[PDB]
Scaffold this active site. Structure first.
Site, PDB file in Angstrom:
ATOM      1  N   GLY C  10      48.952  48.891  79.624  1.00 53.98           N
ATOM      2  CA  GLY C  10      47.844  48.515  78.772  1.00 53.98           C
ATOM      3  C   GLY C  10      46.497  48.759  79.423  1.00 53.98           C
ATOM      4  O   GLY C  10      46.380  49.167  80.581  1.00 53.98           O
ATOM      5  N   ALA C  99      49.101  48.775  69.866  1.00 52.76           N
ATOM      6  CA  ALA C  99      49.798  47.625  69.311  1.00 52.76           C
ATOM      7  C   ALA C  99      48.881  46.701  68.522  1.00 52.76           C
ATOM      8  O   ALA C  99      49.349  45.675  68.017  1.00 52.76           O
ATOM      9  CB  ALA C  99      50.478  46.835  70.435  1.00 52.76           C
ATOM     10  N   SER C 140      48.074  42.545  80.965  1.00 51.21           N
ATOM     11  CA  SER C 140      47.378  41.399  80.403  1.00 51.21           C
ATOM     12  C   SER C 140      48.327  40.584  79.534  1.00 51.21           C
ATOM     13  O   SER C 140      49.315  41.100  79.004  1.00 51.21           O
ATOM     14  CB  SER C 140      46.179  41.845  79.564  1.00 51.21           C
ATOM     15  OG  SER C 140      46.605  42.559  78.412  1.00 51.21           O
ATOM     16  N   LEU C 252      55.174  40.044 102.667  1.00 53.65           N
ATOM     17  CA  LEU C 252      55.022  39.257 101.449  1.00 53.65           C
ATOM     18  C   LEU C 252      56.328  38.584 101.049  1.00 53.65           C
ATOM     19  O   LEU C 252      56.315  37.460 100.533  1.00 53.65           O
ATOM     20  CB  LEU C 252      54.521  40.154 100.316  1.00 53.65           C
ATOM     21  CG  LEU C 252      54.376  39.513  98.936  1.00 53.65           C
ATOM     22  CD1 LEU C 252      53.396  38.354  98.975  1.00 53.65           C
ATOM     23  CD2 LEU C 252      53.938  40.557  97.918  1.00 53.65           C
ATOM     24  N   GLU C 254      58.535  37.305 102.987  1.00 48.42           N
ATOM     25  CA  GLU C 254      58.696  36.084 103.767  1.00 48.42           C
ATOM     26  C   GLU C 254      57.849  34.960 103.184  1.00 48.42           C
ATOM     27  O   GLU C 254      58.267  33.796 103.177  1.00 48.42           O
ATOM     28  CB  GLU C 254      58.327  36.355 105.225  1.00 48.42           C
ATOM     29  CG  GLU C 254      58.929  35.378 106.220  1.00 48.42           C
ATOM     30  CD  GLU C 254      58.724  35.817 107.654  1.00 48.42           C
ATOM     31  OE1 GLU C 254      59.123  36.951 107.990  1.00 48.42           O
ATOM     32  OE2 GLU C 254      58.154  35.035 108.443  1.00 48.42           O
TER      33      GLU C 254
HETATM   34  N1  LIG Z   1      40.539  41.383  83.771  1.00 50.12           N
HETATM   35  C1  LIG Z   1      40.546  42.312  82.819  1.00 50.12           C
HETATM   36  N2  LIG Z   1      41.056  42.018  81.571  1.00 50.12           N
HETATM   37  C2  LIG Z   1      41.068  42.955  80.593  1.00 50.12           C
HETATM   38  C3  LIG Z   1      40.565  44.225  80.841  1.00 50.12           C
HETATM   39  N3  LIG Z   1      40.697  44.953  79.713  1.00 50.12           N
HETATM   40  C4  LIG Z   1      41.265  44.180  78.761  1.00 50.12           C
HETATM   41  N4  LIG Z   1      41.509  42.941  79.291  1.00 50.12           N
HETATM   42  C5  LIG Z   1      42.115  41.811  78.564  1.00 50.12           C
HETATM   43  O1  LIG Z   1      42.979  42.298  77.552  1.00 50.12           O
HETATM   44  C6  LIG Z   1      42.844  41.528  76.367  1.00 50.12           C
HETATM   45  C7  LIG Z   1      42.535  42.458  75.198  1.00 50.12           C
HETATM   46  O2  LIG Z   1      43.699  43.217  74.989  1.00 50.12           O
HETATM   47  P1  LIG Z   1      43.974  44.652  75.657  1.00 50.12           P
HETATM   48  O3  LIG Z   1      44.012  44.611  77.163  1.00 50.12           O
HETATM   49  O4  LIG Z   1      42.940  45.631  75.147  1.00 50.12           O
HETATM   50  O5  LIG Z   1      45.400  45.005  75.004  1.00 50.12           O
HETATM   51  P2  LIG Z   1      46.310  46.231  75.502  1.00 50.12           P
HETATM   52  O6  LIG Z   1      47.206  45.730  76.608  1.00 50.12           O
HETATM   53  O7  LIG Z   1      45.455  47.386  75.970  1.00 50.12           O
HETATM   54  O8  LIG Z   1      47.210  46.659  74.235  1.00 50.12           O
HETATM   55  P3  LIG Z   1      46.659  46.604  72.723  1.00 50.12           P
HETATM   56  O9  LIG Z   1      46.985  45.292  72.044  1.00 50.12           O
HETATM   57  O10 LIG Z   1      47.252  47.767  71.965  1.00 50.12           O
HETATM   58  O11 LIG Z   1      45.165  46.803  72.781  1.00 50.12           O
HETATM   59  C8  LIG Z   1      41.741  40.508  76.595  1.00 50.12           C
HETATM   60  O12 LIG Z   1      42.280  39.222  76.779  1.00 50.12           O
HETATM   61  C9  LIG Z   1      41.053  40.977  77.860  1.00 50.12           C
HETATM   62  O13 LIG Z   1      40.636  39.881  78.632  1.00 50.12           O
HETATM   63  C10 LIG Z   1      40.050  44.532  82.094  1.00 50.12           C
HETATM   64  O14 LIG Z   1      39.602  45.654  82.323  1.00 50.12           O
HETATM   65  N5  LIG Z   1      40.042  43.570  83.082  1.00 50.12           N
END
Ligand SMILES: Nc1nc2c(ncn2[C@@H]2O[C@H](COP(=O)(O)OP(=O)(O)OP(=O)(O)O)[C@@H](O)[C@H]2O)c(=O)[nH]1
Ligand SMILES: Nc1nc2c(ncn2[C@@H]2O[C@H](COP(=O)(O)OP(=O)(O)OP(=O)(O)O)[C@@H](O)[C@H]2O)c(=O)[nH]1
Ligand SMILES: COc1cccc(-c2cc(NCc3ccc4[nH]ccc4c3)nc(N)n2)c1
Ligand SMILES: [Ca+2]
Ligand SMILES: [Ca+2]
Ligand SMILES: [Cl-]
Ligand SMILES: [Mg+2]
Ligand SMILES: [Mg+2]
Lengths: 423, 61, 440
Positions: C10, C99, C140, C252, C254
């Protein structure tokens, strides 16, 4: 690679659709001939969403122009940006519909629908990955209302796993003298409740109240009303047309805005409405006077909301002000959908405005609009007025009763979630 | 050691089956949804063909 | 030998992978073209860095990684970015439609069409390993792909690679950057589905990372680039034990023995210090004692929770840079006499320590100052359940009205999966309560 197919049907549908293509064409740097004359590459990064790239570096709207009267077809072909549309994407009938829903949905529209689906099909097959369709039309006439809903049902048949959204102009006595508009609107909603994912309710009553009271324009013309519509439609589509850090497609946006399948009727909003500070823009954009649907948000509760800001501004200040409005107006947001307010920012502002804001609200106060239409409907149906126009085309009278009950159901459903509580 | 092998294999077995089960039920459910959607639209087209036929009887009057 | 395969799923996983592998290349002196002048063993070797990089006969050092996303825009930036040459095209896998923040689409509808390809590409990496150790999965909770497809992948990896270890780096949703109302739904669904398939999961709260960037780096409004570059430092500290070697380096694995008393209780809390801007760092070098104290200030945790109001089951300190045991033991002694550190009655209160002598590196043009020593604390505290509680509460508010549930049912899911997953979270919250009670 996420292409949208645009459809415009009927008198109203074809005019506001033209305004749409005029505005975004200017924003993307496309001239009436289809040539790019822009300064930044950001104009083109998402040009494919609404344009096909043809030989000769020409960009052609992915749009089909439809009507049961040939008059409008020349009017569109001659206005600004007339020759940029694909000429074979113009689809016409001869007779017309005479502001009769049955003619557009069952008899005359059915005669022409197949030829329309042919042009739709050929446009969709040439899409790397079609995301869905958008329709511009009115609900008070005959062609855009009747045939528009028929076209949606046929597209939902061949493309059941694609998003279908509409920009629907709701009728109002303040702009139209025709009397059977409540019938057509109620019959259209009965179809839209079932066959659309998102419906932006552009209410002519609100557009008039805005042009007359706020903009101080006595005797408003259709051009005055549609200038508001083009500004709104431009703002709503900015999320897809420009490359922000939002990776959103029509389905993702619908997933975030539609908590229940039938409650997908949005209140549009725009600010400023004149012809400015971030706090003032945010306070104005949540005002009842700035809504494109004749409804007071303080008379209901928000299921979901989306605010789009355009221009060069403090993203920190936007976040703070958006949190301020929520905190100070928490009573008007349902507490069983946490974090139900979304914010998008586009560095590119519209033409002749340093800063603007577009508002998309799924509020239970939208019932006020449907109640208004239901009242005008029942005033006639209990009197069986002008029914001969419709039964003369093969319709039974309970078909009116079914649509009426379905809209009253929709209103009651909005009331159920307005009264719902967490604990 | 035989027990250790037995547990690793069963964990793999249970996982393979439960996954296959989930993604057969999901295929069935999504198909049943779209099948009902189309059958509703096809039922609309019957009422549409009926409305056209009801107009055709009274124009013969 | 003992190689690790990283899987980035993702947008969040891919972009965090971008920052991590950029940081790895800098720490090991690998150039964007994959060349590493200091490696004299061409085309192979058993160096510590070979656990994360393979070698080609032409001298290129290729990450043992796979990037996957159901839409191509994010991985496309990798295919054309500074480190395009690092990865072989087959390691970058993309679908065409995402998705749409729907767990069902990532697990069933859309994930179904690409899962076999991904597994085959992962198999091509495993066949290059002499003694594969396990997997590192970056994703995520909130995204439809990051949640749904990850769950599908984890399930399939348990089948193709038995109990071979699998570690998660999971992005916990925070409203400051979470632009999706349905992220609570996806979070519970994926946590439930992967729980039996994950041996250890490191959760990162975007709100915590967000506040740290605002507080300690004076960034008015941090971006994903700011968050990810910080996340990379935590990831690097955790993986430094596998990529470097030394006489004080503790593996890690351990640490993992101490951090997981029960299979379900495998969610360590990570704390990192120092996070300091170059303007402050100038003429203010932090000592071993100062950074160790910072490990117990909750404002430096990867997840918002209160260890003071919970109990510890394990406390691990991973130092990297100019650190020697004497200074570590002194600092720990002072901390024990000043702070609320209560262990459960059924485990020892000692602290497991590891030191890497290779100092921290920072990305050019970043906001982090280069420091001579740094530390990441891994602690098994019951307080981590607070994160489950907040998330479960938001789940209950929407599910009581079945809000947005139709989007999942439309893709083939049943209401039972929702209630099944929620009940598992209720047990998990109860498990954490149980482990903290005193014995009899
Ligand atoms: N820490 C961090 N979180 C991210 C980043 N990009 C997206 N997120 C998190 O991802 C969530 C939004 O969904 P996406 O990451 O775009 O979903 P995806 O895994 O790409 O898959 P889709 O549902 O198809 O978009 C939010 O909760 C964001 O906080 C990032 O670059 N860094
Ligand atoms: N704002 C705005 N509304 C319009 C415009 N043109 C038509 N309408 C609206 O359209 C409604 C009437 O429908 P029609 O104009 O006949 O459009 P139609 O649905 O295609 O109906 P027919 O083509 O006549 O069969 C009225 O309520 C008008 O307010 C326009 O240019 N601007
Ligand atoms: C009818 O055809 C179209 C064509 C183009 C766009 C849209 C559209 C725009 C939109 N803009 C604001 C918004 C809403 C939810 C969001 N979630 C995360 C960012 C975010 C931003 N919202 C919706 N629902 N549709 C509809
Ligand atoms: Ca007028
Ligand atoms: Ca080597
Ligand atoms: Cl859909
Ligand atoms: Mg007309
Ligand atoms: Mg994505």
């Amino acid at each position: 690679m996420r292409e949208i197919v645009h459809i415009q049907a009927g008198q109203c549908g074809n005019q506001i659709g033209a305004k749409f293509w005029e505005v975004i064409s200017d924003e993307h740097g496309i001239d009436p001939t289809g040539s790019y004359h822009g300064d930044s590459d950001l104009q083109l990064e998402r040009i494919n969403v609404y344009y096909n790239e043809a030989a000769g570096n020409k960009y052609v709207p992915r749009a089909i122009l439809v009507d049961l009267e040939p008059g409008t077809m020349d009017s569109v072909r001659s206005g600004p940006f007339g020759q940029i549309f694909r000429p074979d994407n113009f689809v016409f009938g001869q007779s017309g519909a005479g502001n009769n829903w049955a003619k557009g949905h069952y008899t005359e529209g059915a005669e022409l629908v197949d030829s329309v689906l042919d042009v739709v099909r050929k446009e969709s097959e040439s899409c790397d990955c079609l995301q869905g369709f958008q329709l511009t039309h009115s609900l008070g006439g005959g062609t855009g209302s009747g045939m528009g809903t028929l076209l949606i049902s046929k597209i939902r048949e061949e493309y059941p796993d694609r998003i279908m959204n509409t920009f629907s102009v709701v009728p109002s006595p303040k702009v139209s003298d025709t009397v059977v508009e409540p019938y057509n609107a109620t019959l259209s909603v009965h179809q839209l409740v079932e066959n659309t994912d998102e419906t932006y309710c552009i209410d002519n009553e609100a557009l008039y109240d805005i042009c007359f009271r706020t903009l101080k324009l006595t005797t408003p013309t259709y051009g005055d009303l549609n200038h508001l519509v083009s500004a709104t439609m431009s703002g709503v589509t900015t999320c897809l047309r420009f490359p922000g850090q939002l990776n959103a497609d029509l389905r993702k946006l619908a997933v975030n805005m539609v908590p229940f399948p039938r409650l997908h009727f949005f209140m549009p909003g725009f600010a400023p409405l004149t012809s400015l500070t971030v706090p003032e823009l945010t306070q104005q954009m949540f005002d009842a006077k700035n809504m494109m649907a004749a409804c007071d948000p303080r008379h209901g509760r928000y299921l979901t909301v989306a605010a789009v800001f355009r221009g060069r501004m403090s993203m920190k200040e936007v976040d703070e002000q958006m949190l301020n409005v929520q905190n100070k107006n928490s009573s008007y947001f349902v507490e069983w959908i946490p974090n139900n307010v979304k914010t998008a920012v586009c560095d590119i502002p519209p033409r002749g405005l340093k800063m603007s804001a577009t508002f998309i609200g799924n509020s239970t106060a939208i019932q006020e609009l449907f109640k208004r239409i239901s009242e005008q409907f029942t005033a006639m149906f209990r009197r069986k007025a002008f029914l001969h126009w419709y039964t003369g085309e093969g319709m039974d009278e309970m078909e009116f009763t079914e649509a009426e009950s379905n809209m009253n159901d929709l209103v009651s459903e909005y009331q159920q979630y307005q009264d719902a509580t967490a604990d | 050691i035989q027990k250790a092998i037995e547990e690793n294999n069963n964990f793999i077995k249970m996982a393979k089956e439960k996954l296959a089960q989930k993604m057969e039920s999901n295929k069935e459910n999504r198909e049943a949804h779209l099948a009902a959607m189309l059958e509703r639209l096809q039922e609309k087209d019957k009422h549409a063909e009926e409305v056209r036929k009801n107009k055709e009887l009274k124009e013969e009057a | 030998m003992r190689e690790c395969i990283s899987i980035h799923v993702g947008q969040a996983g891919v972009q965090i992978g971008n920052a991590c592998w950029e940081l790895y290349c800098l720490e090991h002196g690998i150039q964007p073209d994959g060349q590493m002048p200091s490696d004299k063993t061409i085309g192979g070797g058993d160096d510590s860095f070979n656990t994360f990089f393979s070698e080609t006969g032409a001298g290129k050092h290729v990450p043992r990684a796979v990037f996957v996303d159901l839409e191509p825009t994010v991985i496309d930036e990798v295919r054309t970015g500074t480190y395009r040459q690092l990865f072989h095209p087959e390691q970058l896998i993309t679908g065409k439609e995402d998705a749409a923040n729907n767990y069902a689409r990532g697990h069933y509808t859309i994930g179904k069409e690409i899962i076999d390809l991904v597994l085959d590409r992962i198999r091509k990496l495993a066949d290059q390993c002499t003694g594969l150790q396990g997997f590192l999965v970056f994703h995520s909770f909130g995204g439809g792909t990051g949640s749904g497809f990850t769950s599908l992948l984890m399930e399939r990896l348990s089948v193709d690679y038995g109990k071979k270890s699998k570690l998660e780096f999971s992005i916990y949703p925070a409203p400051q950057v979470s632009t999706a109302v349905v992220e609570p739904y996806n979070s519970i669904l994926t946590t439930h589905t992967t729980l039996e398939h994950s041996d250890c999961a490191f959760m990162v709260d975007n709100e915590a990372i967000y506040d740290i960037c605002r507080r300690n780096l004076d960034i008015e409004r941090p971006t994903y680039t700011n968050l990810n570059r910080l996340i990379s430092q935590i990831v690097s500290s955790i993986t430094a034990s596998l990529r470097f070697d030394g006489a004080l380096n503790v593996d890690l694995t351990e640490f993992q023995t101490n951090l997981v008393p029960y299979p379900r209780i495998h969610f360590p809390l990570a704390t990192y210090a120092p996070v300091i801007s170059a303007e402050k760092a100038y003429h203010e070098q932090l000592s071993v004692a100062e950074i160790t104290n910072a490990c117990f200030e909750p404002a430096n945790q990867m997840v918002k929770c209160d260890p003071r109001h919970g109990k510890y089951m394990a406390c691990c300190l991973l130092y990297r840079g100019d650190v020697v045991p004497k200074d570590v033991n002194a600092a720990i002694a002072t901390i024990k006499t000043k702070r609320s550190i209560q262990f459960v009655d059924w485990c020892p209160t000692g602290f497991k320590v590891g030191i890497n002598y290779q100092p921290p590196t920072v990305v050019p043009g970043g906001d982090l100052a280069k420091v001579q020593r740094a530390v990441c604390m891994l602690s098994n505290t019951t307080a981590i359940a607070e994160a489950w509680a907040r998330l479960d509460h938001k789940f209950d508010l929407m599910y009581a009205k079945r809000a947005f549930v139709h989007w999942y049912v439309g893709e083939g899911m049943e209401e039972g999966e929702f209630s099944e997953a929620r009940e598992d979270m209720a047990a998990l919250e109860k498990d954490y309560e149980e482990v903290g009670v005193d014995s009899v």
